[PDB]
Protein backbone atom coordinates (compact mmCIF):
# COMPACT_ATOMS: atom_id res chain seq x y z
CA UNK A 1 0.00 0.00 0.00
CA UNK A 2 3.21 2.08 0.20
CA UNK A 3 1.57 4.27 2.83
CA UNK A 4 1.96 1.15 4.99
CA UNK A 5 5.46 0.14 3.85
CA UNK A 6 6.77 3.69 4.13
CA UNK A 7 5.75 3.74 7.80
CA UNK A 8 7.34 0.35 8.49
CA UNK A 9 10.71 1.27 6.99
CA UNK A 10 10.65 4.63 8.77
CA UNK A 11 9.86 2.90 12.07
CA UNK A 12 12.59 0.32 11.49
CA UNK A 13 15.18 3.03 10.84
CA UNK A 14 14.30 5.02 13.96
CA UNK A 15 14.26 1.85 16.07
CA UNK A 16 17.68 0.89 14.73
CA UNK A 17 19.07 4.28 15.75
CA UNK A 18 17.80 4.05 19.33
CA UNK A 19 18.91 0.46 19.93
CA UNK A 20 22.34 1.37 18.55
CA UNK A 21 22.57 4.51 20.69
CA UNK A 22 21.84 2.80 24.02
CA UNK A 23 23.61 -0.50 23.28
CA UNK A 24 25.05 -1.87 26.54
CA UNK A 25 28.80 -2.46 26.28
CA UNK A 26 28.53 -6.23 26.90
CA UNK A 27 25.40 -7.00 24.87
CA UNK A 28 25.97 -10.01 22.56
CA UNK A 29 24.34 -8.20 19.60
CA UNK A 30 26.67 -5.70 17.89
CA UNK A 31 25.88 -2.35 16.31
CA UNK A 32 26.47 -3.95 12.91
CA UNK A 33 23.95 -6.71 13.67
CA UNK A 34 21.51 -4.04 14.85
CA UNK A 35 21.99 -2.00 11.67
CA UNK A 36 21.27 -5.19 9.70
CA UNK A 37 17.89 -6.00 11.31
CA UNK A 38 14.59 -6.11 9.43
CA UNK A 39 11.09 -5.48 10.78
CA UNK A 40 10.36 -9.05 11.84
CA UNK A 41 13.74 -9.44 13.57
CA UNK A 42 13.14 -6.22 15.51
CA UNK A 43 9.66 -7.36 16.54
CA UNK A 44 11.25 -10.39 18.24
CA UNK A 45 14.11 -8.33 19.72
CA UNK A 46 14.96 -9.08 23.42
CA UNK A 47 14.20 -5.70 24.97
CA UNK A 48 13.94 -6.91 28.57
CA UNK A 49 17.48 -8.30 28.56
CA UNK A 50 18.63 -5.22 26.63
CA UNK A 51 17.39 -3.06 29.52
CA UNK A 52 19.03 -5.32 32.12
CA UNK A 53 22.46 -5.20 30.48
CA UNK A 54 22.02 -1.44 30.22
CA UNK A 55 21.38 -1.12 33.96
CA UNK A 56 24.47 -3.21 34.71
CA UNK A 57 26.54 -0.97 32.44
CA UNK A 58 25.15 2.13 34.13
CA UNK A 59 26.15 0.69 37.50
CA UNK A 60 29.64 -0.08 36.19
CA UNK A 61 29.87 3.45 34.76
CA UNK A 62 28.73 5.16 37.96
CA UNK A 63 30.94 2.93 40.12
CA UNK A 64 33.94 3.90 37.96
CA UNK A 65 33.39 7.65 38.40
CA UNK A 66 33.41 7.26 42.20
CA UNK A 67 36.26 4.72 42.26
CA UNK A 68 39.32 6.92 42.87
CA UNK A 69 37.62 8.90 45.64
CA UNK A 70 36.38 5.79 47.46
CA UNK A 71 39.84 4.22 47.26
CA UNK A 72 41.31 7.33 48.91
CA UNK A 73 38.66 7.19 51.64
CA UNK A 74 39.31 3.50 52.33
CA UNK A 75 42.99 4.26 52.86
CA UNK A 76 42.03 6.99 55.33
CA UNK A 77 39.84 4.65 57.40
CA UNK A 78 42.63 2.09 57.84
CA UNK A 79 45.00 4.87 58.88
CA UNK A 80 42.19 6.12 61.12
CA UNK A 81 41.96 2.66 62.69
CA UNK A 82 45.65 2.55 63.60
CA UNK A 83 45.80 6.20 64.71
CA UNK A 84 42.75 5.79 66.94
CA UNK A 85 44.38 2.63 68.32
CA UNK A 86 47.68 4.30 69.25
CA UNK A 87 45.63 7.18 70.64
CA UNK A 88 44.02 4.72 73.06
CA UNK A 89 47.37 3.19 74.04
CA UNK A 90 49.06 6.54 74.68
CA UNK A 91 46.08 7.85 76.65
CA UNK A 92 46.25 4.76 78.86
CA UNK A 93 49.97 5.31 79.49
CA UNK A 94 49.14 8.97 80.09
CA UNK A 95 46.49 8.15 82.71
CA UNK A 96 48.73 5.63 84.49
CA UNK A 97 51.61 8.10 84.81
CA UNK A 98 49.22 10.67 86.30
CA UNK A 99 47.78 8.26 88.88
CA UNK A 100 51.29 7.00 89.73
CA UNK A 101 52.72 10.52 90.06
CA UNK A 102 50.21 10.86 92.93
CA UNK B 1 -2.45 -8.09 3.61
CA UNK B 2 -2.90 -4.71 5.27
CA UNK B 3 -3.52 -6.66 8.49
CA UNK B 4 -0.04 -8.21 8.65
CA UNK B 5 1.04 -4.70 7.68
CA UNK B 6 -1.13 -3.03 10.32
CA UNK B 7 0.06 -5.61 12.87
CA UNK B 8 3.72 -4.98 12.01
CA UNK B 9 3.12 -1.28 12.58
CA UNK B 10 1.44 -1.85 15.96
CA UNK B 11 4.22 -4.14 17.23
CA UNK B 12 6.89 -1.77 15.98
CA UNK B 13 5.06 1.16 17.55
CA UNK B 14 4.79 -0.67 20.86
CA UNK B 15 8.50 -1.55 20.96
CA UNK B 16 9.41 2.03 20.12
CA UNK B 17 7.12 3.29 22.89
CA UNK B 18 8.78 0.96 25.40
CA UNK B 19 12.26 2.09 24.35
CA UNK B 20 11.52 5.81 24.44
CA UNK B 21 9.74 5.38 27.78
CA UNK B 22 12.63 3.51 29.41
CA UNK B 23 15.23 6.15 28.59
CA UNK B 24 12.94 9.19 28.79
CA UNK B 25 14.97 11.99 30.40
CA UNK B 26 13.28 13.16 33.60
CA UNK B 27 12.63 16.68 32.32
CA UNK B 28 11.45 15.91 28.80
CA UNK B 29 8.37 17.97 27.79
CA UNK B 30 6.79 14.74 26.47
CA UNK B 31 5.52 12.56 29.31
CA UNK B 32 5.53 8.79 29.65
CA UNK B 33 1.75 8.99 29.41
CA UNK B 34 1.95 10.91 26.13
CA UNK B 35 4.55 8.45 24.86
CA UNK B 36 2.45 5.40 25.72
CA UNK B 37 -0.39 6.66 23.48
CA UNK B 38 1.61 8.08 20.55
CA UNK B 39 0.70 6.64 17.16
CA UNK B 40 3.01 5.92 14.21
CA UNK B 41 2.91 9.43 12.74
CA UNK B 42 3.59 10.96 16.16
CA UNK B 43 6.58 8.67 16.78
CA UNK B 44 8.01 9.16 13.28
CA UNK B 45 8.10 12.94 13.88
CA UNK B 46 9.34 12.53 17.46
CA UNK B 47 12.11 15.01 18.40
CA UNK B 48 14.87 12.47 18.97
CA UNK B 49 17.75 14.91 18.64
CA UNK B 50 16.71 16.81 21.75
CA UNK B 51 15.71 13.53 23.42
CA UNK B 52 19.24 12.18 22.95
CA UNK B 53 20.80 15.46 24.06
CA UNK B 54 18.74 15.74 27.24
CA UNK B 55 19.66 12.14 28.01
CA UNK B 56 23.38 12.91 27.85
CA UNK B 57 22.88 15.91 30.13
CA UNK B 58 21.03 13.74 32.63
CA UNK B 59 23.64 10.99 32.41
CA UNK B 60 26.43 13.51 32.99
CA UNK B 61 24.59 15.00 35.97
CA UNK B 62 24.21 11.50 37.41
CA UNK B 63 27.90 10.60 37.21
CA UNK B 64 28.91 14.03 38.52
CA UNK B 65 26.70 13.39 41.55
CA UNK B 66 28.25 9.97 42.18
CA UNK B 67 31.70 11.60 42.10
CA UNK B 68 30.72 14.44 44.42
CA UNK B 69 29.14 12.16 46.99
CA UNK B 70 32.35 10.15 46.73
CA UNK B 71 34.52 13.23 47.18
CA UNK B 72 32.53 14.44 50.20
CA UNK B 73 32.79 11.03 51.86
CA UNK B 74 36.56 11.06 51.30
CA UNK B 75 36.91 14.60 52.68
CA UNK B 76 34.98 13.72 55.85
CA UNK B 77 37.18 10.66 56.35
CA UNK B 78 40.34 12.72 55.89
CA UNK B 79 39.26 15.33 58.44
CA UNK B 80 38.40 12.58 60.92
CA UNK B 81 41.91 11.27 60.27
CA UNK B 82 43.32 14.78 60.72
CA UNK B 83 41.80 15.34 64.17
CA UNK B 84 42.77 11.86 65.36
CA UNK B 85 46.35 12.46 64.19
CA UNK B 86 46.14 15.80 66.01
CA UNK B 87 44.89 14.30 69.29
CA UNK B 88 47.65 11.69 69.04
CA UNK B 89 50.23 14.47 68.72
CA UNK B 90 48.86 16.39 71.72
CA UNK B 91 48.59 13.32 73.97
CA UNK B 92 51.97 11.95 72.87
CA UNK B 93 53.46 15.33 73.78
CA UNK B 94 51.88 15.30 77.25
CA UNK B 95 53.16 11.75 77.70
CA UNK B 96 56.74 12.80 76.96
CA UNK B 97 56.51 15.82 79.26
CA UNK B 98 55.59 13.66 82.28
CA UNK B 99 58.28 11.13 81.29
CA UNK B 100 60.95 13.71 82.08
CA UNK B 101 58.97 14.74 85.21
UniProtKB/Swiss-Prot annotation, chain A:
Residues 66-102 form a coiled coil. It is found in: Nucleus; Cytoplasm, Cytosol; Chromosome; Nucleus matrix. Highly expressed in smooth muscle, pancreas and testis. Phosphorylation is required for ATPase activity and recruitment to damaged chromatin. There is a cross-link at residue 32 (Glycyl lysine isopeptide (Lys-Gly) (interchain with G-Cter in SUMO2)). It comes from the Eukaryota. Homodimerizes upon ATP-binding and dissociate upon ATP hydrolysis; homodimerization is required for gene silencing. Interacts with HDAC4. Interacts with ACLY. Interacts with TASOR and MPHOSPH8; the interactions associate MORC2 with the HUSH complex which recruits MORC2 to heterochromatic loci. It is linked to Charcot-Marie-Tooth disease, axonal, type 2Z: An autosomal dominant, axonal form of Charcot-Marie-Tooth disease, a disorder of the peripheral nervous system, characterized by progressive weakness and atrophy, initially of the peroneal muscles and later of the distal muscles of the arms. Charcot-Marie-Tooth disease is classified in two main groups on the basis of electrophysiologic properties and histopathology: primary peripheral demyelinating neuropathies (designated CMT1 when they are dominantly inherited) and primary peripheral axonal neuropathies (CMT2). Essential for epigenetic silencing by the HUSH (human silencing hub) complex. Recruited by HUSH to target site in heterochromatin, the ATPase activity and homodimerization are critical for HUSH-mediated silencing. Represses germ cell-related genes and L1 retrotransposons in collaboration with SETDB1 and the HUSH complex, the silencing is dependent of repressive epigenetic modifications, such as H3K9me3 mark. Silencing events often occur within introns of transcriptionally active genes, and lead to the down-regulation of host gene expression. This is ATPase MORC2. It comes from Homo sapiens. The lineage of its organism: Eukaryota, Metazoa, Chordata, Craniata, Vertebrata. The gene is MORC2. The chain holds residues 901 to 1002 of 1032 of the full protein.
Amino acid sequence: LSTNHETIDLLVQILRNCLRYFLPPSFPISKKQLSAMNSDELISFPLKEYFKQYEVGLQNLCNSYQSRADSRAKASEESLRTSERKLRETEEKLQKLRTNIV
